[PDB]
Curated annotation (Swiss-Prot):
Pfam families cross-referenced by the UniProt entry: Toxin_12
MF terms in GO: calcium channel inhibitor activity; potassium channel regulator activity; sodium channel regulator activity; toxin activity
Post-translational modifications reported in the UniProt record: An unnatural amidation at Ser-35 provokes a 14-fold increased toxin ability to inhibit Nav1.2/SCN2A and a ~2-fold decreased toxin ability to inhibit both Nav1.5/SCN5A and Nav1.6/SCN8A.
Phenotypic consequence of D31A: Decrease in ability to inhibit Nav1.2/SCN2A and Nav1.7/SCN9A
Site entry: Pharmacophore for Nav1.7/SCN9A: L6, L19, W27, V29, W30, D31
Annotated protein name in UniProt: Beta/omega-theraphotoxin-Tp1a
Organism: Thrixopelma pruriens (Peruvian green velvet tarantula)
Amino acid sequence: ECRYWLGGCSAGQTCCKHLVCSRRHGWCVWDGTFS
């Protein structure tokens, strides 16, 4: 299943809609706002 904000993605994980796997933060961040 997809993870939510600050869910904690990985190399083989995914993030729910409106979110992106932040490899820098180490967790799913808001897509469109993150850096």
